[PDB]
Design a protein around this ligand. Structure first.
Ligand code: MG
Ligand code: MG
Ligand code: MG
Ligand code: MG
Ligand code: MG
Ligand code: MG
Ligand code: MG
Ligand code: MG
Ligand code: MG
Ligand code: MG
Ligand code: MG
Ligand code: MG
Ligand code: MG
Ligand code: MG
Ligand code: MG
Ligand code: MG
Ligand code: MG
Ligand code: MG
Ligand code: MG
Ligand code: MG
Ligand code: MG
Ligand code: MG
Ligand code: MG
Ligand code: MG
Ligand code: MG
Ligand code: MG
Ligand code: MG
Ligand code: MG
Ligand code: MG
Lengths: 106, 127, 146, 197, 172, 61
RNA sequence: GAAAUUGUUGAAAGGGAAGGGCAUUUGAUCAGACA
RNA sequence: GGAAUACUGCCAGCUGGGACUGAGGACUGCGACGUAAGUCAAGGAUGCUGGCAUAAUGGUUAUAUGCCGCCCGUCUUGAAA
RNA sequence: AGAACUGGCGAUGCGGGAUGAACCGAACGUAGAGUUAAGGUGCCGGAAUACACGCUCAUCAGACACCACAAAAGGUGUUAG
RNA sequence: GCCCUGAAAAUGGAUGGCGCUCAAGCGUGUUACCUAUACUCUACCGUCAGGGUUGAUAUGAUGCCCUGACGAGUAGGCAGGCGUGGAGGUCAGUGACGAAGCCUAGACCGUAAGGUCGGGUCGAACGGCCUCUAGUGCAGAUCUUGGUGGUAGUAGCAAAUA
RNA sequence: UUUGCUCCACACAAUAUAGAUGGAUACGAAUAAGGCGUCCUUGUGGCGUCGCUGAACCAUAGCAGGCUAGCAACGGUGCAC
């Protein structure tokens, strides 16, 4: 068909933070179509990949990926907390991420 | 080719540089403890440089260990190189800086027979 | 109030200790009223505290209660030879309550999982805070902290 | 969802709409606001006019060209309220404001597009009946806005063209609905009805 | 101060050798839980008799449940409250289905209209008005009209999404 | 936050080893350390502790 | 034949200072084992 | 007159999803399941599988981004002054 | 300006009160996970444009302890008694 | 009770800001949620206390090992270590096939004081370890001596007729 | 200033991403009121019907989508004129 998407669209909001102190180790992720902490239990443990482009080609490709996973929920509006092997850069606040359907429990 | 060890963990890899060593040329980067009455670094305000303390000490299992897993032992000739003949899995010989070029050839040849690793085998190497 | 807290072995926040109710001990509780929350424990609360957070004071050391041998070795002369005998002397105040209670290291609890349930803790339980005598309601609070 | 969201500013509250838009910008959404002269502010006309005159007297004493700038246009009035809810002095804040567009009326690039509304900021759904409110277009003219007649003249022309488009579209929808109803009562329609479609 | 329950508290003085088996005193208390009800019992008893908690005891405490929780009733309440300067008496009428659900309305009204907290309000008596025309407050009598009927104009519907694609309507 | 009832990291205040560097004296300490550990006799513990005393604490007899 | 200071070449950043701490993106550069 | 349910409490009742941790290094102890030999979730992780073997991970360094960060020394109850 | 009791600042960072030596919470070895305190959850700003009963419309409204001020006397504004 | 009158100060102005009117205001009630170097659990570092272990043929009894708790700090106190000039002893130590010194957003070890290596320049002496000794460690003192900047190709180089 | 400058189609190299991954799907006005359908004497008209959220509508099957045979309609859709 004209659509080949096997992931759920998401947005990187910000790091976990207080009023004036932030923690880059934990990033807040907003999942489209979720507006309830109970509805966010489905996506716990799902893999998150941030995909970006670079000018230089390394391993036969000019596309690089940062991997992560969903750990827990955050707030009453369906926001979840995600942790990555390397923390996402601060310039990606508002960038699109990919949340895959594996590991699967259906 | 050393003894098995747990993964080495560095608690603070960043160098502890003296405060305002980058502000004035007369202040060296060698660490010095701030002892002023109003010093912000001494009073440990948020956003200032961290100071050395005993909490940063490394694990005794992997202390003094090189990334290859061997300890570094300085050698200057054949006689002190032979002290590691029975400890090739724990120590790695390193040739001193003042050894002449011709004497380094003898040490490297002797170390190959005994199976002792050398950390600087390309010093003063006329290639 | 500081000295009384030390006499009850309450040196860090969220520490617990069983106290036998007498005329002398009631006056102690009144002095430290603003700083502590106390009530009447049940059998279920006592059993879970000992099994999960039970540590004994043996030769000035904190030793986990992981086997009945240590109880026998330190409380055999008082007729206690099992962890349930230790629980029995607590729920039912026996002749050897003082020795059994002093054997247990003061309990080290965490913050409640569901919270304290009030916006401001440092008010009396009657007025809507945390400290005071909340009687049987303490069992709900202790289990959250344990 | 849409790559660009176009919001009709008519019948909205300035403060509540600005808060909604400011949050969308920081999340990576692009927002376009049209008909900024039809925005509403709670409170009577005289109250908001007096508040603006208080803002007018705030300027740098030794040089008036360095102090606060008192923009008069309704689009700029909404922009000022929106900029105060975004940390515009950071690189991240500047990026968010680059995703925002505010216009008076509906300019030709967006006249043939779909406009949405925000139920949170709607005046009819928020203010109690009988309360007083101020239209932003009328207030701006009172403080020195000089393009209220041209906006009204062009907006009236736009409605005439859009009404003609709707009449043609309405007739086409009527024809399609008649054909769809005729095609019902068949086996395919019955099977779709069993599965909810 | 919370969701209200009605507790019957019966107390007594400590028996002595001179007068064994002293008299029993009872009073209804509105409280959030059992702990507050017993404390309020001694608060009111110390204003009536020479007795306090140390020299007295609680004989029995029982919760009072409404006999007919699902029947609309008219309640008249007498209260004594302290303002910022002086003490005032007050009579108000509340229409509800239970005493516990009518006392909570009273505390909301007193706090909203007179800025009176829980600590400065005494409930003198709560009674049910049995016969019509004994109601003397017009804001209650208007709901006692035969065949009551009123609409709900200007309905506002909550929205789950930020954006809406049509102009809403307030019909109902 | 701990409300200490006493001083922390306080040393015992008694000598554990002799202050002197006499090799023969340290041999006697090693000998009686073994005895005081594997004989449970009060005499051995007294002699071991007395070997640590200073000159003014060991008057001539 | 050191530092302050200066010239040329090369790389980088710069909207009313510069410098610093934590984390990561990018560019350049580098050690370790191939058993 | 006979039930139901709400509220509170107990279970040494069962069971699903997610996250962090793997310290120790022959055996010894307390137990469980078995007629037995043995086995085990019982004094701290093992089994299986894939790709790559190099700047890919990582280190250093420059820059960019989010948050934070006032100039040291000194006298002083009090110093960014 | 000078005394009594206690707790603090000086000698002290950390979260909160925008901002502050003393107030609130709480005192500190280097890290990881969980739960909270005081204070908060429209946007800046991490967290309900939550739910519930009322009151208030100010041509100088009001908005949170220490704390950054307001009175006597009045109103057929409105509400309750 | 809330609101209004009473209620007048000087650069432009601050419920922290925007802004908010069945509030995002005031009184009160019930839940959910956010986050401290605080609390619970684990790892690692150090300190303190209490213990185990001399039996050769394998190296430290100031050694190895087990258990528990603890860690803020000015004036000040004590302890364990790093570095410099010189001295006694030792390694039959390094060295014109290149000592020392200096340069080096190159590599490694230590919590740190510091140590070591590669490359470049350079030309004659120097280091490890156990001990002895002192004119032994600098950022300040309107410190001493010497050298060099921004200001700056700036002020200025205009009395006495040409 | 050694055939430069400019538009067009693709041939190849380098450059960067504030962040495509089925479709930004078009009346106006009122809200103590309107949308759509129908009739008439065309009105501030009569009748019917809808709302209570886009949870919609369109689109969507094939080597990220190949090579061929046939049937029914004369539709639907892409590109270049
Ligand atoms: Mg290092
Ligand atoms: Mg000071
Ligand atoms: Mg929680
Ligand atoms: Mg609280
Ligand atoms: Mg920034
Ligand atoms: Mg003008
Ligand atoms: Mg130079
Ligand atoms: Mg990397
Ligand atoms: Mg920065
Ligand atoms: Mg700052
Ligand atoms: Mg002074
Ligand atoms: Mg000072
Ligand atoms: Mg002083
Ligand atoms: Mg303030
Ligand atoms: Mg937010
Ligand atoms: Mg409220
Ligand atoms: Mg903590
Ligand atoms: Mg501590
Ligand atoms: Mg200390
Ligand atoms: Mg340099
Ligand atoms: Mg040399
Ligand atoms: Mg010479
Ligand atoms: Mg000197
Ligand atoms: Mg100097
Ligand atoms: Mg100094
Ligand atoms: Mg000088
Ligand atoms: Mg000079
Ligand atoms: Mg000149
Ligand atoms: Mg002159």
């Amino acid at each position: 068909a004209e659509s080949h998407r096997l992931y759920v669209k998401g947005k990187h909001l910000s790091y976990q933070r207080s009023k004036r102190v932030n923690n880059p180790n934990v990033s807040l992720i907003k999942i489209e179509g979720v507006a309830t902490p109970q509805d966010a239990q489905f996506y716990l443990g799902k893999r998150i990949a941030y995909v970006y482009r670079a000018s230089k080609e390394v391993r036969g490709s000019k596309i690089r990926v940062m991997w992560g996973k969903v750990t827990r929920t955050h707030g009453n509006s369906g926001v979840v907390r995600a942790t990555f092997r390397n923390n996402l850069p601060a310039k990606t606040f508002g960038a699109s991420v990919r949340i895959f359907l594996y590991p699967s429990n259906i | 080719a050393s003894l098995p060890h747990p993964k080495i963990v560095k608690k603070h890899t960043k160098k502890f540089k003296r405060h305002h060593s980058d502000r004035y040329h007369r202040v060296a980067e060698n660490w010095r403890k701030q002892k002023g009455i109003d010093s912000v670094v001494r009073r440990r305000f948020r956003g200032n440089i961290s100071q050395p303390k005993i909490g940063y000490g490394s694990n005794k299992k992997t202390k003094f260990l090189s990334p290859s897993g061997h300890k570094t032992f300085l050698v200057a000739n054949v006689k002190d190189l032979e002290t590691l003949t029975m400890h090739t899995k724990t120590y790695a010989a390193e040739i001193a800086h003042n050894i002449s070029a011709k004497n380094r050839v003898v040490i490297l040849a002797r170390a190959k027979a005994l199976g002792i690793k050398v950390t600087n085998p390309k010093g003063r190497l006329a290639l | 109030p500081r000295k009384v807290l030390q006499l009850l072995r309450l040196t860090r926040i969220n520490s617990g200790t069983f106290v036998k109710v007498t005329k002398a001990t009631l006056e102690l509780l009144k002095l430290i009223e603003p700083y502590v929350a106390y009530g009447y424990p049940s059998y279920s609360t006592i059993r879970q505290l000992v099994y999960k957070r039970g540590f004994g004071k043996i030769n000035k050391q904190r030793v986990p209660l992981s086997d009945n041998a240590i109880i026998e070795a330190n409380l055999g002369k008082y007729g206690i030879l099992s962890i349930d005998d230790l629980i029995h002397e607590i729920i039912t105040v026996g002749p050897h309550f003082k020795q059994a209670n002093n054997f247990l290291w003061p309990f080290k609890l965490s913050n409640p999982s569901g919270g304290w349930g009030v916006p401001r803790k440092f008010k009396h339980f009657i007025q809507g805070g945390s400290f005071g005598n909340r009687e049987e309601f303490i069992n709900k609070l202790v289990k959250s902290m344990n | 969802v849409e790559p660009v969201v176009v919001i009709d500013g008519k019948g909205h509250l300035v403060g509540r709409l600005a808060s909604v838009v400011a949050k969308q910008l920081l999340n990576g959404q692009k927002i376009v606001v049209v008909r900024a002269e039809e925005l509403n502010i709670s409170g009577e006309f005289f109250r908001n006019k007096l508040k603006y005159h208080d803002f007018l007297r705030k300027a740098t004493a030794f040089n008036k060209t360095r102090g606060p700038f008192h923009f008069r246009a309704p689009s700029r009035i909404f922009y000022k309220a929106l900029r105060g809810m975004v940390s515009h002095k950071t690189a991240r804040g500047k990026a968010a404001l680059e995703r925002l567009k505010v216009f008076e009326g509906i300019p030709p690039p967006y006249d043939k597009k779909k406009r949405v509304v925000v139920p949170q900021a709607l005046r009819v759904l928020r203010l109690k009946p009988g309360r007083k409110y101020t239209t932003l277009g009328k207030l701006s003219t009172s403080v020195g806005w000089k393009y209220e007649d041209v906006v009204a003249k062009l907006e009236a022309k736009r409605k005439v063209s859009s009404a003609e488009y709707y009449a043609k579209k309405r007739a086409f929808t009527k024809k399609v609905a008649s054909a769809n109803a005729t095609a019902a009562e068949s086996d395919v329609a019955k099977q779709l009805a069993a599965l909810g479609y | 101060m919370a969701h209200f329950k009605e507790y019957q508290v019966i107390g007594r003085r400590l028996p002595t050798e001179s007068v064994p088996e002293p008299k029993l005193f009872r009073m209804r208390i509105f409280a959030s839980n059992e702990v507050i009800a017993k404390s309020r019992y001694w608060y009111f008893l110390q204003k009536l008799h020479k007795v306090k908690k140390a020299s007295g005891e609680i004989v029995s405490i029982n919760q009072i449940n409404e006999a007919h929780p699902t029947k609309v009733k008219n309640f008249g309440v007498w209260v004594r409250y302290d303002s910022r300067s002086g003490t005032h008496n007050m009579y108000k009428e509340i229409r509800d289905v239970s005493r516990v659900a009518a006392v909570e309305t009273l505390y909301q009204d007193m706090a909203a209209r007179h800025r009176a907290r829980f600590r400065s309000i005494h409930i003198l008596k709560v009674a049910e008005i049995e016969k019509t025309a004994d109601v003397k407050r017009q804001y209650v009598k208007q709901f006692l009209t035969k065949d009551l009927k009123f609409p709900l104009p200007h309905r506002v519907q909550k929205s789950t999404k930020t954006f809406s694609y049509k102009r809403p309507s307030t019909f109902y | 936050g701990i409300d200490h009832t006493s001083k922390q990291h306080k040393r015992s205040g008694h000598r554990t080893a002799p202050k002197s560097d006499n090799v023969y004296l340290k041999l006697l300490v090693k000998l009686y350390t073994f005895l005081a550990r594997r004989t449970d006799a009060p005499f051995n513990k007294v002699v071991l502790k007395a070997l640590f005393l200073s000159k003014i604490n060991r008057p001539p007899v």
